[PDB]
Design a protein around this nucleic acid. Structure first.
Ligand SMILES: [Mg+2]
Ligand SMILES: [Mg+2]
Ligand SMILES: [Mg+2]
Ligand SMILES: [Mg+2]
Ligand SMILES: [Mg+2]
Ligand SMILES: [Mg+2]
Ligand SMILES: [Mg+2]
Ligand SMILES: [Mg+2]
Ligand SMILES: [Mg+2]
Ligand SMILES: [Mg+2]
Ligand SMILES: [Mg+2]
Ligand SMILES: [Zn+2]
Lengths: 59, 50
RNA sequence: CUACCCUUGGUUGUGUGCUGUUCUAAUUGGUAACUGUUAUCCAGUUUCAAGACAGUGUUAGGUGGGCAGUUUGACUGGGGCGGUCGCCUCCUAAAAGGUAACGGAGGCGUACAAAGGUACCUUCAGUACGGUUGGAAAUCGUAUGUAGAGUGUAAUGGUGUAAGGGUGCUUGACUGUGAGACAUACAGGUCGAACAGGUGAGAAAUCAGGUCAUAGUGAUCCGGUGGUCCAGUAUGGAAUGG
RNA sequence: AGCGAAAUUCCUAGUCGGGUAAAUUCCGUCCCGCUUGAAUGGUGUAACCAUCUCUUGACUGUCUCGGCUAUAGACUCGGUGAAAUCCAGGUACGGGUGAAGACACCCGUUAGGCGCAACGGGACGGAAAGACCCCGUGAAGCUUUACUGUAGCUUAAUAUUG
RNA sequence: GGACUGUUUAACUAAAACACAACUCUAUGCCAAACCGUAAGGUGAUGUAUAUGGGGUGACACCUGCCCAGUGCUGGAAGGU
RNA sequence: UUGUGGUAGACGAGCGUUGUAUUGGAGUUGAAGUCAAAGCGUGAGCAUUGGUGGAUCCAAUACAAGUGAGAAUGCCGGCA
RNA sequence: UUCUCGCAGUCAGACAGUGGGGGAUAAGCUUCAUUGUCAAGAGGGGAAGAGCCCAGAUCAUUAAAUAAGGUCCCCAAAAUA
RNA sequence: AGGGGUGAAAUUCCAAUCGAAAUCCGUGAUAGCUGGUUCUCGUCGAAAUAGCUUUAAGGCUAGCGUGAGAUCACAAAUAAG
RNA sequence: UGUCAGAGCACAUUAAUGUGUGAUGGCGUGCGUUUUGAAGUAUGAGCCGGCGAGUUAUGAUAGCAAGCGUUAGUUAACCAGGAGAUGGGGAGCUGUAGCGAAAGCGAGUUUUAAAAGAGCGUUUGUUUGUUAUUAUAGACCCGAAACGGGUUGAGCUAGUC
RNA sequence: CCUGAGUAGCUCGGAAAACGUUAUUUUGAGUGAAUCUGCCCAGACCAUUGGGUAAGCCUAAAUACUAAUUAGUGACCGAUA
RNA sequence: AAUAAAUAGUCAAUUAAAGCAAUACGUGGUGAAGUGAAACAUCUCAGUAGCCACAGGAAAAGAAAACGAAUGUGAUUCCGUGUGUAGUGGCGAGCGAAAGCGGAACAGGCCAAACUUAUCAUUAGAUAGGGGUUGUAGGGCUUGCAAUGUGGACUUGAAAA
């Protein structure tokens, strides 16, 4: 069972589950968003427990 | 869309810190404010950058 | 008078290629003759015509359904043509919130260095009487009126000493963050006390992380631009990445 | 120009004349030809046509309108002996109900058991995983100024080469 | 309607379709052009513009008008890309 | 004491088959298979007797699977 | 019925009562909010009816009292005023 | 001789088959689409909705079922105020 | 087209409130499939018998059981062996310290001027057996029209010679 | 003095290599060196350090496969297999 | 033979193969599509099938212009692991090593060229010998010492098991 290549490059896995991820909406359009939105999205975050099943077996 | 935004940069260290919006068609003047600069750690004059 | 640098012309001289000739040995031949040979292929010799062109190999432009592989949306009171495809406000929506239809009305793909932030001052439009140019209607003073005014714009909600109009000073249309909630399948969106740095207004308290609120926008990949208390396929750099 | 309700004309069964007792077809004729038309040819044309279309003489069972006869079957006897179909069946009719049109259900009605020759109303009879329609991120064939490429054809540099 | 005689969808269409005689246009100067083949080779042709391939009409008679802006075709000689 | 309808569907406990292993054991005084019978079980299923038949087979505990048929316009054979 | 973990299934719904839209206060029509039932659910009433009313089947009994509905015969059950 | 041939042209004919033959092989092609899927008893028991979808006969997540485990009081229900 | 009652008739058993038939009353629109819903005027099966459809290899996670255990656990290939269990074989695998994009730091660490704040961490193992689900292989079974490659055919028919 | 010349490179188009063209390796077209103080290499590249000497040939063993000969095995089939 | 000589050609003699199959394995040339991507062209299926040439008992490969980060390994091949890693990919589907490490087996030899010999109308730039085979660089050229021996990738006989 090969690890999905386009996944292992987006979901670093921490101790005790809790898949880690970066936030979207940070690559393209600066002005359309606000400063509050931009500095809230810089900080990385965990994956919702709904997708945890879809991703754990995807790694 | 319309690309009406613009960017302000500090003059002492020349970083490109800030982002704002300006309508060229009315006030052709180049903006020169003075705001907080993280590198310089103080309020420095920022002027517009292309 | 001895030198270095520009505009324009002639010269012996090379160096390139550009068109243009002549010549032939490369090369070509479905010109002829000869031999292998009793052979319309073929090989060899000579002649004849061409002649460094053509044909041929690579490389590169152009025309090219002759040929090949393929796409050519969905909703849809059957399908087609028509219309629509995201976001915002009201009604439908049954007095919490939500709630469909090719149901009823309408808007956005922003605008403002002031229409932001702060201190201070001030508060309708309209109508009536009164007054040169001046008129239904400009402005002037007076009263009257309880919002029919204003609120950048769609509709709704809210707001008459306000969130509306004028002025002085500025740029908080900050940096780094974020306890706790809302609404949410995910992604995302929204609100925000409080803390540190350094500011603006103000006597001070206080206020300020854009506007009265609700739309005003689009993931990922790829590549580029600016900064860098990151790495640099042995080492020092660099390229290339972060 | 010609020709024109045409193999072309929608309104259009145009109008008018002839044929006809009577004529959406037919012949001729006028032209608002919705949109005829000159080598995707136009207009005429003798002969020819298993072509089309209309009128007509003779002609006849095509028909008013149906009859008769003879054979081969059919039918009966002897012999050999298939098929498609088929959930089990001892398989009525009316009104109603019902997945919306009933042998079975409900409420009435009718009917001794079983064949044989017939006929076709029904059993949405049988034969065909509906040809039409729609759907599938289905196929193939064909087209093109749909996309991307390409065999070919043509042009230039370079080698063959002075 | 088509000129005719003919051919055609074996096994639902024989026709007003296809052919055809004739007409015009175009290409082609001989190792012809077009064509099959990767090339050799071959047809065209043991032919030579009174010949051969292609497109379009379709006996015979009379006619074949207007437009070269667009597409296509041919030529152009300085320029632009 | 409270309960016990049930498709899709989750969970539990089980019957049967074929063979291997060790343990017991039946068989020409007639084994399996096959029909018949007026049995026993909550079910999958299991005995008893007799006719036929003419040599292998039954139970207990584990183990392993070509393991369980009414439908596929199913395939093959037979028969209406 | 809150939280975590394994395992699915489902995304063609229908009708009756109620409040409205489209529709023509038409449809066993269509689209919603709500209460039930059916689906996935038998018995009795309804003459016959998936969706109404009553009800919610462990199995046997040739036992008793009832719910909706109903008592001349079919069809079990009633008389008086 | 078949991404060919032949065609007085009809999509004709190419061994009772031709909008591109016949049989073999890749090959058990793929099919969100029909049909089928075989023994028993017990316990519990749904949905037919929302969001997105070149999606609308399908798919993912939430919602609703089940199993294992915790929370056992302030959590969830049912009545009055 | 049977069932619950029930007469008459004829027999007599895996000894049982018995067996076979069943005039007559009450009651009663099959089975799978797919469907909102089918007795179905929707479809499949003429009948019987046999054959016939969720397995396998290699890995992932979860549940259950077992061995072994706190500097733990555990072998693969290979070699010897009754085409054996097993013995050797520690090379590797997981766990034992995380965080960070990374150099690095270390029970702390990234972001940050910040040693505040927040994110993440400040121990609960491993190898097998068995079962459920899942991945790559046709992966429950049957079912195309088709796509490509190699060959065989002009003895019918079309054309030419 | 010798130590493998149209050679290694460089350029244009392509590919093998895990790599969709990139160090290394190969090449259809073109050009084209040096000679131990040398040549190549250590993911573009240069210097330092270090490694190896192409452009010539040959090579058993472990490895893959069994239609075949012999002996034998099977929790493989037992005439729809 | 055209052409005088010579070559082409023709005639004769001797030695090799041409083919088959083990539907299998090997190398080499050429090389799809179905399918997956939920469509599709880059890509995958796949250098798979097929066609073809060539052997062989095994073949191919092979003794470093190497690995690659070090006081390092020291031909090739094959198995496990590294690891589903570093990377590569319309960064989608997917693809997937080289080191290092544990192992089975283990062998490395020989020409060209310098120089020298003999002979070719020696115009040799050719024919047959000697000599020499490479990296902590070697060999040749001038000069000495020590050598008689292991060793096989190997010829003929004899004997034995
Ligand atoms: Mg304001
Ligand atoms: Mg404003
Ligand atoms: Mg605003
Ligand atoms: Mg370095
Ligand atoms: Mg008879
Ligand atoms: Mg029928
Ligand atoms: Mg014609
Ligand atoms: Mg004509
Ligand atoms: Mg069944
Ligand atoms: Mg039918
Ligand atoms: Mg390097
Ligand atoms: Zn600065």
């Amino acid at each position: 069972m090969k690890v999905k290549s386009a996944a292992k490059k987006r979901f670093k896995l921490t101790k005790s589950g809790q898949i880690k991820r970066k936030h979207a909406y940070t690559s393209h359009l600066a002005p359309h968003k606000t400063t509050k939105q931009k500095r809230h999205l810089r900080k990385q975050g965990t994956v919702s427990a709904s997708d945890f099943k879809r991703i754990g077996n995807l790694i | 869309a319309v690309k009406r935004s613009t960017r302000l940069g500090c003059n002492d260290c020349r970083e490109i810190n800030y982002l704002t919006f300006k309508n060229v068609k009315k006030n052709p003047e180049k903006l020169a404010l003075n705001k907080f600069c993280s590198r310089c750690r103080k309020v420095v004059v920022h002027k517009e950058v292309k």
